């Protein structure tokens, strides 16, 4: 499984964005997709997680109620719609799965300017 994430860009403060994790290898329908972020010069943080079916979504205590994670298991993708972007929500966003081994995707640089 090779996670290709294409949702990056420059967004001003108080905006909205959508991020994708289009997979290409083994089909991931029976896996929980994770969305992490890495702040500039800090450690990676958990942002969201989604079950096999797009029913049970778990959010970090700092982004709960703003970020929305959903699944599209016909294209084998997980989408993260992030709105109400605070200036502190600038990072590099990564998508993670576990299919035998850990699979990380190339991060997308989400930048917000106050």
């Amino acid at each position: 499984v090779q996670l290709v994430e294409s949702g990056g860009g420059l967004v001003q403060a108080g905006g909205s964005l959508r991020l994708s994790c289009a997979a290409s290898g083994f089909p991931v329908i029976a896996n929980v997709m994770y969305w992490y972020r890495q702040a500039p010069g800090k450690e990676r943080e958990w942002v969201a997680a989604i079950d096999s079916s797009g029913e049970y979504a778990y959010y970090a205590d700092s982004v709960k109620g703003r970020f929305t994670i959903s699944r599209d298991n016909a294209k084998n993708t997980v989408y993260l719609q992030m709105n109400s972007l605070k200036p502190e929500d600038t990072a590099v966003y990564y998508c993670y799965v576990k299919v035998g081994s850990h699979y990380w995707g190339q991060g997308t640089q989400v930048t917000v300017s106050a």
Binding site: A49, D51, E55, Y58, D61, K64
Partner: peptide, 14 residues
């Protein structure tokens, strides 16, 4: 339980 999305062996359980 919103911060524990996956149990050890049985996997994800609501």
């Amino acid at each position: 339980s919103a911060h524990v999305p996956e149990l050890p062996i049985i996997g994800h359980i609501p």
